[PDB]
Design an enzyme around this catalytic site. Structure first.
Site, PDB file in Angstrom:
ATOM      1  N   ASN B  77       0.805  -1.212   0.000  1.00  0.00           N
ATOM      2  CA  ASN B  77       0.000   0.000   0.000  1.00  0.00           C
ATOM      3  C   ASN B  77       0.841   1.268   0.000  1.00  0.00           C
ATOM      4  OD1 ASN B  77      -1.297  -2.294   1.793  1.00  0.00           O
ATOM      5  ND2 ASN B  77      -2.996  -1.201   0.815  1.00  0.00           N
ATOM      6  N   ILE B  84       1.303   7.182   0.931  1.00  0.00           N
ATOM      7  CA  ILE B  84       0.540   6.235   1.732  1.00  0.00           C
ATOM      8  C   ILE B  84      -0.896   6.240   1.234  1.00  0.00           C
ATOM      9  CG2 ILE B  84      -0.110   5.520   4.043  1.00  0.00           C
ATOM     10  CD1 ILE B  84       2.228   7.539   4.929  1.00  0.00           C
ATOM     11  N   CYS B  85      -1.406   5.062   0.885  1.00  0.00           N
ATOM     12  CA  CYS B  85      -2.787   4.909   0.433  1.00  0.00           C
ATOM     13  C   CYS B  85      -3.645   4.549   1.640  1.00  0.00           C
ATOM     14  CB  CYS B  85      -2.885   3.849  -0.657  1.00  0.00           C
ATOM     15  SG  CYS B  85      -4.570   3.497  -1.194  1.00  0.00           S
ATOM     16  N   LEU B  86      -4.266   5.557   2.249  1.00  0.00           N
ATOM     17  CA  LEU B  86      -5.069   5.341   3.442  1.00  0.00           C
ATOM     18  C   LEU B  86      -6.339   6.172   3.352  1.00  0.00           C
ATOM     19  CD1 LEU B  86      -5.506   3.965   6.028  1.00  0.00           C
ATOM     20  CD2 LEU B  86      -4.001   5.591   7.175  1.00  0.00           C
TER      21      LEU B  86
END
Ligand SMILES: [Zn+2]
Ligand SMILES: [Zn+2]
Lengths: 111, 147, 94, 97, 62, 83, 83, 98, 83, 109, 94
Positions: B77, B84-86
């Site tokens: 991710n 950051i893929c959040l």
DNA sequence: CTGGAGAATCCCGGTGCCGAGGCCGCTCAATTGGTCGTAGACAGCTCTAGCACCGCTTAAACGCACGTACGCGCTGTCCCCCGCGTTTTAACCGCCAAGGGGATTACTCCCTAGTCTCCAGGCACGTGTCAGATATATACATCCTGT
DNA sequence: ACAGGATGTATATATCTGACACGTGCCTGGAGACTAGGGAGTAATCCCCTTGGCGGTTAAAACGCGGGGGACAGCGCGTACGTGCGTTTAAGCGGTGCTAGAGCTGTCTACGACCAATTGAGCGGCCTCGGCACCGGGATTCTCCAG
């Protein structure tokens, strides 16, 4: 390696299918060409309208102490809100009934 | 003005410092911050210390901050650019959460990568196909750069 | 074996977003599908007429803003435009 | 014995039928009427049960709305009894005639 | 010199590659360096023969 | 009720902007925030409640037409004990 | 192939009375039971003559629900729940 | 001797008069002032074509005449000849404007 | 910049009387005039709102006849004689 | 040098422009492709309707002893005919006036 | 110098074929043009929806017959269909 | 109910104006002739659903008596609206002047159509459990006649 | 107003069930990368219609006064419609059986988009006179008050 597939709806943070809306627009003979942001805008508008209807419908259902929305609840939600009533003034909902109201003249009165 | 909220959040962070992570401004600019986190225990990244960058947009707390990794890491991710893929950074943003929760979520994603929406397809493929290989490679790169 | 399409999945997702613990009858779902189709046709038809009136050949978000402003009444239209512009902004930001 | 004075049973019927959503016209005679009406435009036509239900829903809703308007007309005429003058006035004002 | 990006002006002399320009853009605004691209990494400004006051354009981020 | 009749500064401050409550608006989820923070966060992110994710769109459209948004009682109470 | 015209009497006096009761009518004069069934057949003729021509244009022999829905829609009486 | 007509007798003759002429019955200058005053609330310093103002007046007068026909029918239905504001309300409500 | 108001009285009592006379009205009550003012104002507000939207969609400051024609046509009151 | 140009309206013996109608159809975003007979049928229908309205309006004008048709005559022609009145029930005609009628109750007696 | 189109010439030709010695005002001609455009749009809109409903992609005279039947009432519709069919027959003859 | 004054309306005629009608560039949009891909016509096969029937239950329709409340007519009042005259005001017309903005043309360039390849999100299909319906025995609010 | 009796009406508990929320296999429609080209944004210019103003005429609006007719409250009377009870009758259900037509697939071809070359029909301009507006004047009709 090319890329991972991210849906345009996920890009716009929507729930309605942006790609499907785009396909319907460009297959519905509405114009020669379709802009990029038009399906994004339309899907958001439709999602907002559906959410607005569903909130009132769920409130009506829980006021009736039931957990499933039936068309009676949709009719009660639509015909109570002035804005939605004016938007859907020329629409008949099957199994919807009518809003209970009685003219004050007909009610009994004396002493 | 986001300055009041940024200063209040920093004051609370100083009042309640975290255990493994740490952050704050690294200069007079409250909008640009550096975050320092340690590898969570029982993780391949354990032992290494990661440094992060922060760029606050001028609408906080009503917009998510621009935060990415300044430490090279091996995570599905997370891209090679440190991004950051959040959800709380993209969609699940809410003005009613603290930066400590963000760091804890980052550490959780370090322990629990999500291959459904990764940033590097190969790392997600390894994580799904060989968990031991992912744990080895993440540890190797933590030792190589984060250590 | 002709596969037909509807909006039941998305309607259910929005319902779960609004009321986390409320179901919807099958017949009500069909009513929601008809409502969605009707509004879609209204807005798309209005946008097509705007584009034809202004001698254009493209339907953009500019036309749909005007169509929503014409169709929806008052505060509902205001909120709908607010929602649409925000989604377009987020889509272009990525 | 017991005897409700006139009007009260009508009010309780109003409250009952404004709370329910059932179809108020008997299905079989309504179907026969529909088939009789359609039999002149084309002969030996066939109908889906869904189509007949749609026709009945639309017709019942139209009649209910017409009665809602015609009740207000009669009240405006300082009465409580509906009579065909009121139906005629409502139809005329709504542009149906 | 001056450099235009299509907007923070101006930027480095014809001496820093695309990576350093993107890093400075990220420092000065917060927009990610790799997000999204440069339209006009290891390439430089003189490699593309980019003169002063040139108009630049700045996908992967999801 | 806010609470209270004497909203000490910690409560009299907004739950978001943390400044003194200016024209506070009481949500259907009974959350109280100032008119600036409310009028920002309404169309700013998701029309939801920042605290308990409550949808407020129907309540907001109900109150906007009648201009019943601002909590008159608490807004007057604050003026009596605070600037 | 033998339907007579008596079916108009199928809409009975109690049925019309309960329709009016739902509509909010207190009491009904005796001349209404003919006027209403006169109105209803006029309405049904208008709708059905549009449904049947849709079916003819589709070269079909049965009248589908969508035909009735379209016929109602073109009269400004859109109906939900059947497609 | 002062000659006077019975009340209503000139009303009928002017009904026949105005139901035969096709002129606009509202004064153009105040109507235009009203139209501009209403349009102030949507965009400032707007400009109007004279044909557009004429079209607005032509539509408004026809709408009002149509409304008056129905509100006269309601007053007649109530068995009286003087139209009263309740009649206008009834007509608008039956027509679905309110 | 030429702000004006109180133009609703420009619709004079004799003008309303002349409209009602064409409508076929014999006798007029005294309370008709104010309510007619209100009705006309509502109708004009509803039409001009759409006309101005049509104009500003095309990005020009002049309200044309075709804009009014479209605004009326979309309200179900098509008007002839203006192209 | 191929052949003498004959308009499709002349081929059908019509008056309205079949070619112009055909162009309007395909430039109107009504469908992807347009059949050959569609403009012919549409032009015939429009010509018939215009002929009907003009006949009635001319009758109304000669009943008013005039030679030039004015919007008043068109209004009088449309409102009298039941078919056209129902067809154009939602249409406002500028300079049209109303059909003269007074309710019998208001007449003196 | 925009070349704008109307139906004035054709309206005048029909008027001379009906009443050879009758004039028409300029404003009446505009009304006739508006009426012609309105009816044309009604018929075309109905035909397009018919073609979409029946999963077609070609508007033919078959759709226009049904559109006329739906729009024009009664005797007017019957006469219009009779008129249209004859013209199509003659056109297809040559 | 039958006449005369008067007020309004209608009708005829002479007059002058300007918009309907006709003519003439002239150009561009219609026509004509090919070609080419494909949307639709048509045959064929399957099976879903619509029509037809019968029998038993019973809820709903139908018919009758009554008496009470409501529709309808009558009457008197009176107050509000109409007709009219006088005074006042601003609409209307003609005219001039400034300029803001609508209406064109060029150009370029960026946005969208089109094609291709890949995969996962949505659809068809099972499935089991629980929201809701039904029954029954309550409490409890409501009406109605007598007091 | 009041009280008790009769009557609906809301409530709690028990049990069934079938409709929904869920899961799985899968396939085709959406996403990604790419190129090409024209739709539209921008600039520049032109001039036309909009706005603003002024002065004079006078038609129309405002005001006022008197009186009459109509809205309205009241009253009395008759009847017709609601309420109830008993007696028919098809609506409704369920089940079975049949087959017409809806729906699908597979071909194949007539037809409509497309493009290039050619010209004349309609748009614009430019007139000119006659249908219509107007003004005055006599003739007709319609209303209303006295009788
Ligand atoms: Zn605040
Ligand atoms: Zn909350």
């Amino acid at each position: 390696a090319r890329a991972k597939a991210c849906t345009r709806s996920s890009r716009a943070g929507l729930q309605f299918p942006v790609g499907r809306v785009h396909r319907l627009l460009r297959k519905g003979n509405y114009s020669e060409r379709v802009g990029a942001g038009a399906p994004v805008y339309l899907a958001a508008v439709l999602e907002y309208l559906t959410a607005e209807i569903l909130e009132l419908a769920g409130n009506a259902a829980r006021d009736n102490k039931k957990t499933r929305i039936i068309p009676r609840h949709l009719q009660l939600a639509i015909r109570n809100d002035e804005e939605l009533n004016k938007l859907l003034g020329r629409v008949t909902i099957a199994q919807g009934g009518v809003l209970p109201n009685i003219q004050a003249v007909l009610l009994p009165k004396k002493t | 003005m986001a300055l009041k909220r940024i200063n209040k959040e920093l004051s609370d962070l100083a009042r309640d410092p975290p255990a493994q992570s740490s952050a704050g401004p690294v200069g007079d600019d409250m909008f640009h911050w550096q975050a320092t986190i340690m590898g969570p225990n029982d993780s391949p990244y354990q032992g290494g210390v990661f440094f992060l960058t922060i760029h606050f947009p001028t609408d906080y707390p009503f917009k998510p901050p621009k935060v990415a990794f300044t430490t090279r890491i091996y995570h599905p991710n997370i891209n090679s650019n440190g991004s950051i893929c959040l959800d709380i950074l993209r969609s699940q943003w809410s003005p009613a959460l603290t930066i400590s929760k963000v760091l804890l979520s980052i550490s959780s994603l370090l322990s629990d990568p999500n291959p459904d929406d990764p940033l590097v397809p190969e790392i997600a493929r390894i994580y799904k196909t060989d968990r031991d290989k992912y744990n080895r490679i993440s540890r190797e790169w933590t030792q190589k750069y984060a250590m | 074996r002709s596969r037909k399409e509807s909006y039941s999945v998305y309607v259910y997702k929005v319902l779960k977003q609004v009321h986390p613990d409320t179901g919807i009858s099958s017949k009500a779902m069909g009513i929601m599908n008809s409502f969605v189709n009707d509004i879609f046709e209204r807005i798309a038809g209005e946008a097509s007429r705007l584009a034809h009136y202004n001698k254009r050949s493209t339907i953009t978000s500019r036309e749909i803003q005007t169509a929503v402003r014409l169709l929806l009444p008052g505060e509902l239209a205001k909120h709908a435009v607010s929602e649409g512009t925000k989604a377009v902004t987020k889509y272009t930001s990525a | 014995p017991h005897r409700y004075r006139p009007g009260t049973v009508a009010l309780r019927e109003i409250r009952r039928y404004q709370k329910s959503t059932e179809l108020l016209i008997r299905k079989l005679p309504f179907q026969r009427l529909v088939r009789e009406i359609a039999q002149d435009f084309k002969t030996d036509l066939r109908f889906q049960s869904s189509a007949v239900m749609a026709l009945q829903e639309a017709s019942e809703a139209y009649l209910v709305g017409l009665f809602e308007d015609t009740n207000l007309s009669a009240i405006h005429a300082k009465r409580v009894t509906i009579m065909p003058k009121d139906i005629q006035l409502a139809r005329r004002i709504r542009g149906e005639r | 010199m001056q450099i235009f990006v299509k907007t923070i002006t101006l930027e480095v002399e014809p001496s820093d590659t695309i990576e350093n320009v993107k890093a400075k853009i990220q420092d000065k605004e917060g927009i990610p360096p790799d997000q999204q691209r440069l339209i006009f990494d290891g390439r430089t400004l003189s490699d593309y023969n980019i003169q002063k006051e040139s108009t630049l354009h700045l996908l992967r981020g999801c | 009720l806010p609470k209270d009749a004497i909203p000490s500064l910690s409560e009299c401050q907004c739950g978001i902007c943390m400044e003194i409550l200016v024209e506070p608006v009481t949500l259907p989820c009974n959350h109280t925030l100032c008119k600036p923070c409310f009028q920002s966060t309404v169309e700013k992110a998701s029309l939801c409640c920042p605290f308990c994710r409550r949808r407020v769109s129907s309540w907001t459209r109900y109150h906007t037409r009648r201009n019943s948004l601002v909590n008159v009682e608490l807004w007057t109470i604050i003026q009596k004990h605070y600037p | 192939r033998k339907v007579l015209r008596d079916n108009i009497q199928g809409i009975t006096k109690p049925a019309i009375r309960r329709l009016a009761r739902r509509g909010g009518v207190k009491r009904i004069s005796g001349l209404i039971y003919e006027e209403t069934r006169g109105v209803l057949k006029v309405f049904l003729e208008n709708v059905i003559r549009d449904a049947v021509t849709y079916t003819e244009h589709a070269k079909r022999k049965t009248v589908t629900a969508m035909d009735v829905v379209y016929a109602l829609k073109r009269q400004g009486r859109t109906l939900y729940g059947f497609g």
